[PDB]
Amino acid sequence: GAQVSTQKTGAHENQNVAANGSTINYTTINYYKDSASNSATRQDLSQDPSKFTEPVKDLMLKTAPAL
Amino acid sequence: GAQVSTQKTGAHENQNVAANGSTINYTTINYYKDSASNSATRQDLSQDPSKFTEPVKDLMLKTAPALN
Amino acid sequence: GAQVSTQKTGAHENQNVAANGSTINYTTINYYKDSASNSATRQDLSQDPSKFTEPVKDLMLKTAPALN
Amino acid sequence: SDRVRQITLGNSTITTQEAANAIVAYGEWPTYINDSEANPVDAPTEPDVSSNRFYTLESVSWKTTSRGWWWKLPDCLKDMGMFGQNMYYHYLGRSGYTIHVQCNASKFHQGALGVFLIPEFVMACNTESKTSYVSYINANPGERGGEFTNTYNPSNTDASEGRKFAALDYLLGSGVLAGNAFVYPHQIINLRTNNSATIVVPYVNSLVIDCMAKHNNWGIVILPLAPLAFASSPQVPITVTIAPMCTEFNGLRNITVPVHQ
């Protein structure tokens, strides 16, 4: 039931490729029936700034005349 | 000899079982030979209220006049 | 998700070549989100002293006249 | 051609000769509540054209000394048309909006108006001795809306002036600097290039549907960003035209008649 995930890169870890060695992984097990008891979940690095920076009905390209 | 099962869902879940992958699993091991020592059982959500709300000999239908 | 590595030799080992079987091993599991939380790294004895003792553009051999 | 926009719904259309590209807040259009999730179980009321049309709020003038204007969105149409009536008859409701602000001027008039749509627009109490103290009437001014002040002067619970909101313009009536108002969906009616601007408003809450007589999902804030000037104080008219979208209601009650001034 244990999960294995990649650790955040430290001072003397591998290349920024983050795909080198088994020593960069960590193991974790949930010990509770209630998921609220789980340690913080993994970070979601997905982003979509256009939701707030370009919420335009009609899409525009950067070099297009704005008006 | 561990048991693995799902968790009651929390704030970041989509509320579907296994739709959260392995995120919602947990591991439990009994450490005692006497079952009295075990932690609480899995919730049993099965139920049947007719034992108390419709305990009748003549089957009642909802649309039939009750007093046929 | 454990790793098994050999141990540095102790008093009882008659194999200073680390060849006495499964007898000498240790098991490690990382328990944290960041690698900064991991224990000290595996020993790495690779060395190259020429970097500091013979950083000569021209290759020199030990019996070569240093200068011809 | 981005310049000319013909926007329509129901039995009404607004045509603007010069407008900036329209904004859809958060990239979403209002929709009806899908059957995958709902609080109420009554079959819904869907007024369609009776509510999904443009309504015009009383205009205001842009004097060179104005500090801004504000409206509570479902409040401003509460007594207007059939939309108003349906809001009073049903307990729950959901609606998105089309907010289209117009302000026409010739090329010689400079200055600009920022139009911001703020979900949960919450203003400070003018009374300093009380927290969040405001009456239903002062909190909900109607189609006229309210105005911002350049200065905060607590009445110390004197003649209900303390129930009225504090409304500093530079702090948006809340203690938050106006320069960051741009985080909210917004458009600028910079008179030199645009006569109008349109923003699509999805229904936003922690709930799928709520009671419109109690909760204002959004407010409208209009501020001079740049001073009005002309070469004399022209008082250029500002008109706010609003249309509900995908309006729905749920649960018929007695018509609600809120305390009246």
Added chain:
Amino acid sequence: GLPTMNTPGSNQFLTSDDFQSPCALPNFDVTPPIHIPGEVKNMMELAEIDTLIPMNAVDGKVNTMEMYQIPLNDNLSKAPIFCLSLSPASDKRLSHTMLGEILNYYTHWTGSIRFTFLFCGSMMATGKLLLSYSPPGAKPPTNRKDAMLGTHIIWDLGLQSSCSMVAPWISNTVYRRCARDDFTEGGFITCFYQTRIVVPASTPTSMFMLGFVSACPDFSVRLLRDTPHISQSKL
């Protein structure tokens, strides 16, 4: 031997704790189970059972058997017979019912609530009653006309005497509080006549009705709390 770290939360006593522990009487074999009828698996199975509503607890009719008897008559009236706040937890009469008692062990609840009325008149009695539910946030029902702007049932008294109305689950929220507050307005239930009760000569002129309340199958409760109806002297 095995390196470990004691995290916060260690060695604390939580009343909601679900950790294992040694058996004080290890290897005690449990007395074998037998089938016993009436097994209850969920408290909701009891919440769904019709229970009388203590509706006439007024002026000395409180804490007596007559407390559950709603008076009816053959006179002319445009007034309600009775009125209930919907809130099953805060209404003084609904709180003290089986539904209210189970419910009072919870803070949040949701779902539709069934109201069933039984007429206990003469066989020769006729008439029609208007029972309705008015969602919250508007002028209260007051008279018989405003009371029809909402969910209603017209109960035609007949051999199938009992009938029911369901106050549908209408709320802005997902769940409502059991606690009384101003926000969680339950709405109202009232009943008034469509027509007066009519009886022939030399028969009873007044009658009683018994109202019942029960949970619908879509009903649920959440967080547990101590119940305010239980009390004890200080120990």
Added chain:
Amino acid sequence: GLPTMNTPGSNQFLTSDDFQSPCALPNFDVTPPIHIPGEVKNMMELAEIDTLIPMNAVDGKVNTMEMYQIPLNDNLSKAPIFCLSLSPASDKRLSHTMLGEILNYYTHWTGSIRFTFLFCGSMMATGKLLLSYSPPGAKPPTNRKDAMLGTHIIWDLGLQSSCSMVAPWISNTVYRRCARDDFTEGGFITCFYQTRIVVPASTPTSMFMLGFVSACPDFSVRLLRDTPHISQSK
């Protein structure tokens, strides 16, 4: 009992401690999520939103609406229109912008910064403005001729009402501190007239522009910290 040993770190409470704990409310039924428009994933998504800069934070303008209005003359001037320190966290005017406010919660920052200007003057007003950025460690660009010796654009005033310049990430260090330090010197942002603004008869002679600041897509932060811009009585 399995032999164990408690290591240093036992029985301590760290506010950033990330571990499991028992549920206060076992089997609690959590309200299903619903879709709500406007989901945010990262603070940087807000850092990238244009914020109006309180540039005219001068005596009589500070804390009034006019602080956001940068004046422009039709009249001849060889003076800078404005001068601003680059550091978004340290600078007095920028520390209160959304970018600044987010960065005030961080110890270090990196990446280019976008400066966008909007002209709100008469439509019939014409002219050109010079916007430029000079990296730190040299005399400030107080003379237009030096202002040109750096990153710059010339903004043609017209229907394309706005323009922008991006202060490139030029730094000796990988990240700069959000602290008001001398080592991680910000650099200089200035604007000069390229030419005087000329307007037709019966047009105001006082024009305004609104400057905005936002993070670019290459932008990031390192470490979270308490901000200095909010306080509370003891």
Added chain:
Amino acid sequence: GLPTMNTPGSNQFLTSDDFQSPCALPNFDVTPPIHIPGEVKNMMELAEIDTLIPMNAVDGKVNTMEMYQIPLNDNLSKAPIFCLSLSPASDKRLSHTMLGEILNYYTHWTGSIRFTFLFCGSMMATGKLLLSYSPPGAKPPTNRKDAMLGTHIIWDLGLQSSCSMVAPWISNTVYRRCARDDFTEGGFITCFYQTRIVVPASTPTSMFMLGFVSACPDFSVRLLRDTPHISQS
């Protein structure tokens, strides 16, 4: 509720331990590495670097630059030019060389030690020197004959001016103490003239030579310890 027992050693702080520890700054992004020049992997890579021996720490030459200059003369002499005891972490002159300083952080050590000498004389001068190492437990060399009996090399003056001698690892124990010890000494290093330095006309009649010390490739240390050279009020 897994039953456990805390063994001795529990709840103690060992400065030399190796346990995992939670990060106080979770998910912190660490500045990416670059290829920084001059990477060192081991302290022994530095132990093998030749540094000067402050051999002439004698009155008038103590704690000055001249301390590293070994005098030579063209006159007849039967005396040793110099003498060192081979105690690299305890001798007054050797404990301060790079080899000694790295070694001052260790308790015990092994391997051979190399010495290199350089003539900083005129080009005009010629002659020969005897470098010699004598193992422990005997009268240290008092004259040239003793120097010839033990391990030695003849260093001629010539174009390849530098000459090295290696004091081979001869020891009873495997490792020697770094610390001065009556039991363990590393033997003796000396130098004598093999022949008089011959100096042509108008040529300096006195010279200097420099001496260097470094670890040989078979060198190692056993245990890290605090050094005596640095202190604090």
Added chain:
Amino acid sequence: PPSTQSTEATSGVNSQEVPALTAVETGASGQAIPSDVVETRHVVNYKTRSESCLESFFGRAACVTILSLTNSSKSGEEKKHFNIWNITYTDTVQLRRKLEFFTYSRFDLEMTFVFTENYPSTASGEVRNQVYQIMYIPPGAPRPSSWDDYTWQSSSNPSIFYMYGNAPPRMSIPYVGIANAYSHFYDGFARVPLEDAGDTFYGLVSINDFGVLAVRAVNRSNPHTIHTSVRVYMKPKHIRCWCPRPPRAVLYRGEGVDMISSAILPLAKVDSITTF
């Protein structure tokens, strides 16, 4: 992992279509990057936005409240044995400001408690190890009227017990809420007055009731009064937010959103607009 954006190498541009020109009136932000503005070099960019994730931003346990309890020999102080606090996050400004960036949020809450004690009196003598009970009283649940009432039985109420010197106690609290997210703002009233009124019912506070926290010193009174303090800490985890707002610029007054007439001046002066 996903990463931040890289820079491509560029050269001179003579395009009739220019990325540096735009119109912010549309509501869109300017989109230009350095490669559009100046000639650039290629740069590989691994400076990942992890610290800025909402999950990391809100990952610290902030102090939220201070409770003050006294275990005293004086009969007039029995009541001081007992302290009830409303659950709220508005008591401390640093946490409140962070939470108020978002209009709505959903998260699981982790609570940790820290206990301390001292002597409030000059006189002292032996005091036994103190143990404390923290009982949660959900909304509408009966509250104790005093320190040792029957309600402390806590048959349904969650309750935790702690002794000094032991590890700080804690518990995880699954998202609890009436709505599908917590609201930090509420532009509305608890009740609509019907045909002036409602003055006391405006804002989030009028609809905010999650129950209260009751703390009690369990030890019976000793001859030497001991003064204790409980520091309550909170952090969100497994957190999502649905609507950015600017943070508060000036000092807060009360639980709701309001202002201090003497503290509405967040900015400082500079000598002139042309002074750096």
Added chain:
Amino acid sequence: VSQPPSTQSTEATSGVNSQEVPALTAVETGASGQAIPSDVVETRHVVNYKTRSESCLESFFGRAACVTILSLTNSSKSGEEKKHFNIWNITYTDTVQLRRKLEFFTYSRFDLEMTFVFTENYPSTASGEVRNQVYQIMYIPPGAPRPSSWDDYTWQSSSNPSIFYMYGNAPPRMSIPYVGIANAYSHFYDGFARVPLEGENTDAGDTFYGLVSINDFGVLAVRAVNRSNPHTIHTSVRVYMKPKHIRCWCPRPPRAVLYRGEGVDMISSAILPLAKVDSITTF
């Protein structure tokens, strides 16, 4: 599971009459001669299984060291509030043994562990009873607000990390990732934080030459959490720090003289590292 490499082994070697002899070289080239005993004298074969494990940089710098000692007082007198907490600059400068080891390299990159050893005693004869106290160690990154007193709002630590420890329990411990800005920490800085320009003070740089002006990692703020007692108790924290996952670059000489201050500056009374010997020929 591979056998680690050993130090150089010796091949049996005969004497030689070679005309190519490694004994002579030219150190002037900047290169060390490489002779091993088999190049100088006759040698036997020696199997070498010895290693350099203890000299690995990871092992060399693998011990925790005391880096600073902080002190604070829990008391109840009108002039004592200011003594309730201690604010300290993060540095390794305070203790010489660790500093000297670090100074062997010009640059270094590592993660750190922080361990805190707490103690307390009575500075006063009152010798009264006090309760076991909780102490708070809060980290305040540079530019973050600092507390004015021990009882203040900044101690809320909503963004700053902070650790709470009880006296009598295991020493608290935490890991810190490399937080340098550069790709390594610099142990030395041959430069200025800023460049005084033509329009400046002649002496400019006097207040900022050196590492002292660019190295700023914030402070630790330590307070007793407990309210004060009638009986004064004096306490202190011995802060221990350890490099971990450490690599270094560009080796340099170790310090030969008594340190003093923040830079490399020596004092006149301690510029004489070696002892005198009566003669060049003395053993």
